[PDB]
């Protein structure tokens, strides 16, 4: 477990490692913006 | 105390919120990179001054 | 058992030294767009 | 072998054949399982229950086990084809 | 290779040399010993290893189906180095009227196989399971030889199940891949009686070890050894074949500790 | 086998082919190698044979 | 049906009594069981000595009967052989050996009341499932 | 719009990085962001096994792949591989996640902002691809930080603290590693020894003396490398021998990078050493040997005679000879009698499992040892169900040996594709026809017809 | 081994008189196009 | 005697395909 | 039955088929303690043990055993360490921690001589090594 | 009831969800090189 004094933002940590996959998404998000160029 | 680490750490949680939905922002807009760069790296410098306070004060405890 | 290990390994040795020098030898120029 | 009489007697039945039945078997009569089964299994060739008794060099308590078990076991011709299993014959669960 | 040479080597260069399977020897340096039985004192063997070198085989002289005639022949060896027998260890009583070793324990058997002049393939298990050996003497030495009758199980038992699902312990009492030679009901498959009835049949044989070295200060000896049996039978479907081993013997004779539980 | 040899030799004799044999092909690329070119370019590969 | 109290009782005590397991109970006694012995349990069987099940046979003619909550919690504690005449703690999963058993540190008297229940429960649900093996599953 | 369209590039969207190839700026910037993202998900990986970290259960039962790597490197872990505190891995944690940030504010400035190209603006650091002597420089500078990566796991294992020994007398623990293996016949040996049964290749590594002592060669191979590169220049042999693009390098990295994922894969399935068993739990070979070991110890204990005992086909159901003749443990354990752990050497004597320590001399701890390995072997299915395919949804399980096992091989033959793709490509557009063949002058039509 | 008798017939039979009808195709096609000539 | 069989219409096989390989109808342009 | 409405639970941990909450530390206060009275009686029996180990491994010494005195030193003492540190800590004494790091770095010099086969350090290490445990023992007192 | 750690796990990634695309969606309006 955290320790105690951090163990507040568990919920944060629980989503933490997901973020490189979103990368990716975002990276088509873009290309969906500028309409796939 | 724990109290006081918890907000400080929430601090450079918003902080850091700010810092990746801005300076792209910032960075990308037309006329911003230098214009309003007084902003970014006074930020930068203040999330780097919470993180090394946090890990001071994390000392303590 | 020997002599068939000896062999084998003249045999290996021969093909892998024939691979190994043969695309050392400037392979990438061998296509039909060269000059 | 496609006939074996003493089947029944293998642990299937109320009565065990202690000359050729696996430890297993022991665990249906309460108290005999990991202790007295071993020592039953060592010296496992007897003529009878009570050759036995003498022979397996059981303690007092053992002897009480076996005493209240005694109409459960018997000893018939030794089987080799059993006795090579008998403390292990591949059935686990 | 000496028992003090074994200690010198370590698992890592030991493995994969194929000297794990060679059987001790005692050095010609420690020898002309006697490893004399004192009354009052229980001894026995341990670490009785046997390294058979030469396997032959009594195989008929021509495929006649009557063939009666029957030589011994040459083998090879299609197992590798499983060969070797270690550990074996036993009580030495004075059952009658000399000492006599009877063999309680140890390895003291290998499933191998040979092939023969002409491509057939003999297994056979080479053991000396329940041996009852006699020693010519009351002392160990030079020159003195152990020998004795031995019982060798089945090389199958009873929970082995043949192609056909059919054992002596368990599987199928039937060929069920022919449910219509079953359907008949003057005769069924009776034909098939010999191959579905799997049969467990303790056969015999006889061992000769020959001490040629002997030890007092360890009590080890060692020489040489011929041994007869028979091979598989296949649950009963074969007939035996007779089966002549030679080779080297190590093994130490010590005092009964109480603990060992014969 | 599982013994740890290197490059399985375990006999010494299993070097000769294994160190010549490459020799050989070396001696006769050789030949090959001299004949060109080998000065730098600038170029993804090289187009003179 | 439901898992009504007809399930949920089990025998406590040697003599013969019986406790209503709560809902709450049985829940903590399948996680605790699923995560403390499913392992070599799963199933009401043992893996490493199928001899020795958790069907309610083998617990009835154990020494003593551990067909009951206080013998299985006691069991859970004072681990003995299927004669009850040699301690096993050093091989065992125990409250009392947890240092080398790291599994049984955490749990308390409710733990090991909510696992016996678990245990207890379980034949009631299936047949023969319960430490039935390969042929029930 | 210029340089980020398909008009004036030539590569459409799902190319997008084939546009980053000659502008070097911005590929500095994809690069420096990735490696932002890489150290990103380290931190936040690693604060999340921290999070979910009980103290009960051991590291491998907790589907934990990475507190496993800080263990072995010696940080928090006491004897017999303990995790007693579990602050360090917090430390390692935020660090990682600290600088990523900083990782990634370089790599989105290069990407966005940074120049494009930094060939004029920044010569020392601009390049061309087919400018061989400045990237053999850049190749030599990365082996040279390489190297001092080495050495610093050879200063941890050496005077920091030192590393997690399994093989350490008593139990396993953390130790200093004052004397590697520095005898090039020995490292070297590793690597010339077979990749199949019983020689591993570099994953039999059985001692940390010869990991920590190769290190330092690996280290001083490294460095001694990247000056000579600096220094040097192909020569004529190899300038003639690669196609000098950069799509060509990345090929070859991809293959590298493959060959490493698939010995990673092999490293975390089979070595016990650098993978102690007590933080990535059994491998295959240790459970399957585990079973037979419990089973051996419990037919004993009921009065079997276990190196007398017949199997059903006339094998040693408990012991038997190894095909060179070592005593081994029986039944389908006998493909994995080269497993060597260090709850099982304690019984082995030069000609195998000695039977006077089997028969009398077996410890409590080794059969508790054993179960545990037996019970969680590395079977398991995709949703963690432990145990065989049938079996039933009780155990939640599957081993961290399986998880990176499969990975590794799975991203190994994924750039072993790639590597075939880009290799294939650079030859092609070096040569010129990656676009397809000219009409004009097609080769075929001026080749003689076979047959 | 058991096998069938007339299962030979059957399959030398079959390969063959479908053989010999392709053979016969082949060759009587040919020589029709080099009778052209 | 099956195993003359078997290896005769293996053997056929093969030597179908080397004489389609080695004497195939070599392809040409039309004009 | 005809009209009976599911259950349904929003994310609720009350359910019993809800996956949300701990499963250890619920129910009470854990019945273990450390260094119990069978767990300090295991630790004390393997500490007590380990001198006649060490014996049998310098016997092993003398007679040139490396395998066999490798492997002494893992079997019936792969717990010493764990067994130690528990001991040492209800002592709670900075000499008895020294003495107990001074057995592990002997231990693990005796165990590189003895991969080297060197028999002179082997006997010498050995003995050393049974020198600093019987120092730890009168140390930590009980064994 | 909604599970408090549950709640606070999807308020923290719905707040991560719209984090990357509020950007996009700011540099679109703020006309910026996309
Ligand atoms: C040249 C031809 C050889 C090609 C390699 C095939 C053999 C690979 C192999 O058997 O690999 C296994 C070996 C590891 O070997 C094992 O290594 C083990 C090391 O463990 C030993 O040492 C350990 C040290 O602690 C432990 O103690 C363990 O208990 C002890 O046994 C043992 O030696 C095993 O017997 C031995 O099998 O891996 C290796 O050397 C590492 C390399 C693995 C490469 C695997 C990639 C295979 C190619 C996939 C192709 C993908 C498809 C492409 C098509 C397109
Ligand atoms: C172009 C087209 C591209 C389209 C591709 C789109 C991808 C679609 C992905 C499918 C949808 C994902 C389902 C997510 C749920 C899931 O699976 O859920 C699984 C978990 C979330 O579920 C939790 O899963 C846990 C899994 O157990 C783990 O935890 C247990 C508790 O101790 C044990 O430790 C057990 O051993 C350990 O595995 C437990 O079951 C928890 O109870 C359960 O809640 O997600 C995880 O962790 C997340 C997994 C992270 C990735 C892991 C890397 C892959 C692993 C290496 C194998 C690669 C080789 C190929 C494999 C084939
Ligand atoms: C590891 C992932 C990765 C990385 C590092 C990059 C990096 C890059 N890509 Mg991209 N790309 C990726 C995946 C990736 N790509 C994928 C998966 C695709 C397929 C859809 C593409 C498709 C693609 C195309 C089609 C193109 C690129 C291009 C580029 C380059 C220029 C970007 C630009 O100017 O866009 C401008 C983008 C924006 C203004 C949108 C805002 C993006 C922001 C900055 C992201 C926020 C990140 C983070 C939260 C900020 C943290 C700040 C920090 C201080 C804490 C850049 C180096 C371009 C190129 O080659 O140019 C020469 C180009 O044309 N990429
Ligand atoms: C792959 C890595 C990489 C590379 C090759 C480059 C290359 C470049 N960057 Mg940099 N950059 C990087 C990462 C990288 N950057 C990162 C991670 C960031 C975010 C912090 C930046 C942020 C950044 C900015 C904001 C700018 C550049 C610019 C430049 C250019 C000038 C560099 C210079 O003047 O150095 C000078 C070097 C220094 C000042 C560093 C001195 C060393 C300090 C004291 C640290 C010491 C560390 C110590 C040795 C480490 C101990 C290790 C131990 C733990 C083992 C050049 C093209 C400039 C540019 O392109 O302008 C148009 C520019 O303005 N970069
Ligand atoms: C990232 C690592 C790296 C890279 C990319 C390169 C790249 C290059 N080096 Mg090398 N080099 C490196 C590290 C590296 N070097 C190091 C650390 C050293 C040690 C000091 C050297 C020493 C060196 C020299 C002395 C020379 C080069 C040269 C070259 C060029 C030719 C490479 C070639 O054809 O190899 C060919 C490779 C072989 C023929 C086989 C290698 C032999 C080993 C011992 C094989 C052993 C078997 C192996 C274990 C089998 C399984 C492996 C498995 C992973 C598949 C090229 C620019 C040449 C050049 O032009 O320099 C200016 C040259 O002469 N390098
Ligand atoms: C989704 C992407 C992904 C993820 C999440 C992972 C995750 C992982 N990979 Mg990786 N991997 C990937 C893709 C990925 N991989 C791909 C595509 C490949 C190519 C096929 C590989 C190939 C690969 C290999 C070859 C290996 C891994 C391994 C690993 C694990 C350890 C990471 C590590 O430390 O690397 C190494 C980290 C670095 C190189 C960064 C620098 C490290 C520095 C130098 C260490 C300094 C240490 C020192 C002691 C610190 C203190 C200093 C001082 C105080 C003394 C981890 C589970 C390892 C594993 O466990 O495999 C079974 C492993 O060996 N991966
Ligand atoms: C070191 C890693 C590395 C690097 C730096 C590059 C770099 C590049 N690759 Mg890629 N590539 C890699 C690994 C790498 N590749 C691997 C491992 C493979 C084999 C699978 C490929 C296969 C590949 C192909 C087929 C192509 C490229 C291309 C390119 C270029 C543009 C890619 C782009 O913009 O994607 C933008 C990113 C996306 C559109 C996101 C796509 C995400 C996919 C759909 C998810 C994965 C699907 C599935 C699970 C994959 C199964 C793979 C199988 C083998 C197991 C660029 C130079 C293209 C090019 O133009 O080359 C010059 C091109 O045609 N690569
Ligand atoms: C590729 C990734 C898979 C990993 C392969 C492991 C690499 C280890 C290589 C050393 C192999 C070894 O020592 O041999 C050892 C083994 C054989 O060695 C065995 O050793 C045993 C004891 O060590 C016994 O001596 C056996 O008799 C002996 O066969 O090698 C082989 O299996 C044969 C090698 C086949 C090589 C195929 C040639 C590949 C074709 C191109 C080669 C690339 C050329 C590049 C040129 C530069
Ligand atoms: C201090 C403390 C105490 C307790 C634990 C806790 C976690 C709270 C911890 C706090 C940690 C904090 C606040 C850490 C901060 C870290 C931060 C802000 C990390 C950010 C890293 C940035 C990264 C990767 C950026 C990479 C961006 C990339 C590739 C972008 C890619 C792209 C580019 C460049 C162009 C095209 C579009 C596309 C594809 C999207
Ligand atoms: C700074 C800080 C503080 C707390 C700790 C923490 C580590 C979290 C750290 C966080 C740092 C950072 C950098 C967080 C940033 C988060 C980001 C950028 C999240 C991005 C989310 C992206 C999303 C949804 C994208 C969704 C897009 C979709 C489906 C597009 C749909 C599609 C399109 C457009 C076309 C093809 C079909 C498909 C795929 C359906
Ligand atoms: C670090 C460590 C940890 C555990 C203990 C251990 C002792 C293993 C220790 C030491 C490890 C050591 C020293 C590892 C070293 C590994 C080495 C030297 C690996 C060698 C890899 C070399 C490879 C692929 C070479 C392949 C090169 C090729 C095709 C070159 C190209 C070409 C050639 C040659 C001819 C044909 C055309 C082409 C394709 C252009």
Redesign the pocket.
Same mark, same amino acid.
């Given at each position: 477990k955290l320790p105690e004094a951090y163990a507040v933002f568990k919920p944060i940590i629980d989503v933490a490692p997901v973020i490189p996959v979103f990368?990716?998404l975002? =990276?088509?998000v873009?290309?969906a913006?500028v309409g796939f160029? | 105390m724990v109290g006081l680490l918890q907000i400080l750490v929430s601090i450079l949680i918003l902080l850091?919120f700010a $810092?990746? @939905?801005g @300076?792209?922002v910032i960075?990308?807009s037309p006329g911003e990179w230098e214009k309003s760069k007084g902003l970014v790296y006074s930020a =930068?410098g203040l999330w780097f001054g919470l993180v090394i306070v946090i890990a001071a004060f994390n000392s303590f405890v | 058992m020997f002599t068939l290990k000896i062999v084998v390994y003249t045999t290996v040795t021969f093909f892998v030294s024939l691979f190994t020098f043969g695309f050392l030898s400037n392979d990438a120029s061998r296509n039909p767009n060269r000059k | 072998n496609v006939e074996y009489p003493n089947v029944p007697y293998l642990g299937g039945s109320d009565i065990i054949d202690v000359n050729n039945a696996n430890v297993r078997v022991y665990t249906r009569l309460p108290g005999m399982y990991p202790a007295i089964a071993k020592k039953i299994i060592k010296r496992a060739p007897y003529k009878d229950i009570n050759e036995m008794l003498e022979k397996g060099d059981f303690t007092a308590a053992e002897k009480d086990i076996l005493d209240k078990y005694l109409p459960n076991l018997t000893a018939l011709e030794p089987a080799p084809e059993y006795v090579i299993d008998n403390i292990n014959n591949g059935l686990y669960r | 290779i000496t028992t003090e040479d074994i200690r010198g080597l370590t698992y890592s260069q030991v493995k994969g040399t194929g000297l794990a399977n060679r059987c001790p020897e005692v050095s010609e340096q420690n020898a002309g010993g006697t490893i004399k039985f004192a009354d009052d004192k229980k001894y026995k063997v341990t670490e009785l290893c046997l390294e058979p070198k030469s396997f032959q085989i009594e195989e008929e002289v021509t495929k006649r189906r009557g063939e009666t005639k029957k030589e011994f022949v040459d083998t090879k060896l299609m197992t590798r180095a499983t060969y070797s027998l270690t550990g074996i260890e036993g009580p030495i009583v004075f059952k009658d009227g000399g000492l006599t070793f009877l063999e309680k324990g140890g390895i003291d058997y290998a499933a191998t196989t040979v092939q023969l002049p002409g491509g057939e393939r003999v297994p056979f298990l080479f053991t000396i399971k329940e041996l009852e050996g006699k020693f010519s003497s009351s002392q160990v030495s030079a020159g003195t030889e152990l020998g004795g009758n031995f019982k060798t199980p089945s090389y199958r038992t009873g929970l082995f199940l043949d192609p056909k699902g059919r054992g002596g312990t368990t599987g199928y009492d039937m060929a069920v891949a022919l449910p219509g030679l079953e359907a008949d009901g003057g005769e069924g498959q009776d034909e098939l009686f010999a191959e579905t009835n799997k049969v467990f049949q303790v056969t015999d044989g006889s061992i000769e070890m020959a001490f040629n070295r002997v030890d007092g200060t360890n009590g080890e000896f060692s020489g040489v050894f011929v041994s007869e049996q028979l091979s598989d039978t296949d649950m009963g479907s074969k007939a035996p074949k007779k089966v002549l081993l030679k080779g080297i013997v190590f093994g130490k004779i010590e005092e009964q500790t109480g603990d060992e539980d014969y | 086998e599982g013994t740890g040899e290197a490059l399985g030799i375990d006999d010494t004799r299993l070097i000769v082919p294994v160190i010549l044999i490459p020799v050989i092909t070396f001696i006769l690329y050789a030949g090959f190698a001299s004949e060109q070119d080998n000065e730098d370019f600038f170029d993804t590969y090289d187009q003179r044979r | 049906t439901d898992l009504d109290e007809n399930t949920r009782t089990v025998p406590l005590d040697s003599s013969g009594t019986t406790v209503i397991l709560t809902p709450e109970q049985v829940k903590r006694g399948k996680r605790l069981f699923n995560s403390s012995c499913g392992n070599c349990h799963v199933g009401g069987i043992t893996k490493t000595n199928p001899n020795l099940g958790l069907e309610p046979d083998a617990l009835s003619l154990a020494t003593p009967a551990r067909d009951n909550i206080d013998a299985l919690v006691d069991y859970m504690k004072n681990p003995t052989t299927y004669d009850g005449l040699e301690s096993i703690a050093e091989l065992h999963p125990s409250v009392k050996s947890a240092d080398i058993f790291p599994k049984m540190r955490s749990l308390s008297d409710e733990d090991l009341f909510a696992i016996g229940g678990h245990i207890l429960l379980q034949p009631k649900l299936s047949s023969e499932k319960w430490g039935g093996g390969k042929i029930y599953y | 719009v210029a +340089?980020?369209?398909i008009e004036s590039?030539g590569? =459409?969207?799902?190319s +997008?990085?084939?546009?980053?190839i000659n502008?070097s700026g911005?590929?500095l910037?994809?690069?420096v962001?990735?490696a932002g993202?890489m150290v990103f998900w380290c931190g936040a990986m690693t604060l999340f096994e921290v999070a979910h970290y009980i103290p009960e259960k051991p590291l491998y039962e907790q589907g934990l792949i990475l507190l496993p790597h800080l263990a072995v490197l010696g940080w928090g872990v006491g004897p017999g591989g303990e995790i007693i505190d579990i602050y360090p891995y917090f430390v390692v944690g935020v660090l990682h996640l600290i600088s990523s =940030?900083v990782l +990634?504010?370089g790599?989105?400035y290069?990407? $966005?902002i940074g120049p494009?190209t930094l060939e004029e603006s920044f010569p020392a650091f601009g390049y061309d691809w087919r400018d061989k002597n400045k990237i053999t420089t850049i190749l030599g500078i990365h082996l040279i930080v390489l190297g001092i990566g080495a050495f610093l796991l050879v200063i941890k294992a050496m005077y920091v603290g030192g590393i997690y020994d399994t093989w350490a007398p008593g139990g396993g623990d953390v130790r200093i590693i004052d004397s590697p293996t520095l005898n090039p016949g020995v490292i070297f040996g590793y690597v010339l020894k077979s990749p199949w049964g019983g020689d591993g290749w570099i994953v039999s590594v059985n001692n940390m003396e010869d990991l920590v002592g190769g290190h330092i060669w690996i280290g001083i191979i490294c460095i001694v490398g990247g000056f000579w590169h600096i220094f040097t220049k192909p020569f004529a042999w190899a300038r003639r021998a690669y196609v000098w693009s950069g799509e060509a390098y990345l090929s070859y990295s991809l293959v590298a990078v493959s060959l490493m994922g698939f010995i990673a894969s092999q490293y975390s399935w089979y070595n016990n050493t650098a993978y102690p068993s007590e933080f990535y739990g059994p491998t295959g070979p240790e459970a399957s040997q585990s079973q037979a070991f419990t089973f051996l110890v419990r037919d004993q204990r009921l009065g079997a005679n276990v190196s007398s005992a017949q199997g059903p086909t006339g094998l040693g159901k408990y012991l038997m000879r190894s095909p060179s003749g070592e005593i081994i443990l029986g039944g389908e354990t006998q493909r994995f009698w080269d497993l060597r752990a260090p709850w099982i050497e304690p019984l082995r004597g030069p000609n195998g499992l000695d039977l006077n320590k089997i028969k009398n001399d077996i410890q409590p701890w080794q059969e508790r040892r054993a179960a545990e390995y037996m019970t969680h072997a590395p079977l398991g299915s995709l949703n963690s169900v432990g145990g065989v395919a049938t079996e039933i949804n009780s155990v939640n399980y599957v081993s961290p040996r399986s998880w990176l096992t499969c990975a590794h091989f799975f991203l190994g033959f994924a750039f072993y594709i790639g590597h075939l793709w880009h290799a294939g490509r650079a030859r092609a557009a070096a040569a010129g026809f990656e676009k397809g063949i000219n009409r004009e002058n097609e080769p075929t039509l001026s080749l003689r017809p076979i047959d | 081994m058991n096998v069938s008798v007339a299962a030979y017939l059957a399959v030398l039979l079959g390969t063959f008189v479908p053989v010999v009808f392709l053979v016969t195709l082949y060759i009587q096609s040919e020589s029709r196009k080099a009778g052209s000539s | 005697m099956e195993t003359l069989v078997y290896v005769f219409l293996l053997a056929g096989t093969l030597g179908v395909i080397f004489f389609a390989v080695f004497f195939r109808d070599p392809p040409r342009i039309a004009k | 039955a005809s009209g009976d409405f599911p259950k349904q639970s929003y994310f609720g941990a009350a359910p019993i088929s809800a996956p949300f909450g701990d499963t250890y530390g619920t129910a009470g206060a854990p019945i273990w303690e450390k260094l119990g009275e069978t767990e300090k009686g295991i630790f004390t029996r393997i500490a007590q043990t380990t001198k006649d180990q060490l014996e049998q491994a310098s016997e092993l010494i003398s007679l040139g055993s490396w395998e066999a005195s490798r492997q002494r030193l893992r079997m019936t003492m792969y717990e010493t360490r764990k067994s130690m540190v528990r001991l040492t800590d209800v002592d709670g004494s900075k000499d008895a921690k020294d003495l107990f790091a001074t057995f592990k770095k002997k231990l693990e010099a005796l165990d590189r001589a003895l991969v080297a086969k060197d028999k002179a350090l082997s006997i010498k290490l050995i003995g050393d090594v049974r020198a600093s445990y019987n120092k730890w023992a009168a140390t930590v007192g009980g064994v | 009831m909604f599970n408090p750690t549950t709640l606070f796990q999807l308020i923290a990634l719905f707040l991560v969800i719209t984090?990357?695309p509020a950007?996009?969606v700011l540099?679109a309006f703020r006309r +910026?090189? $996309?």
């Open positions: 990368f990716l975002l =990276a088509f873009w290309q913006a160029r | 850091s $810092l990746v @939905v @300076v792209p960075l990308v =930068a | - | - | - | - | - | +340089g980020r369209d590039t590569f =459409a969207w799902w +997008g990085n084939s546009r980053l502008v911005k590929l910037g994809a690069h962001a990735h993202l =940030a +990634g504010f790599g989105v290069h990407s $966005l494009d | - | - | - | 984090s990357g950007i996009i540099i +910026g090189n $996309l």
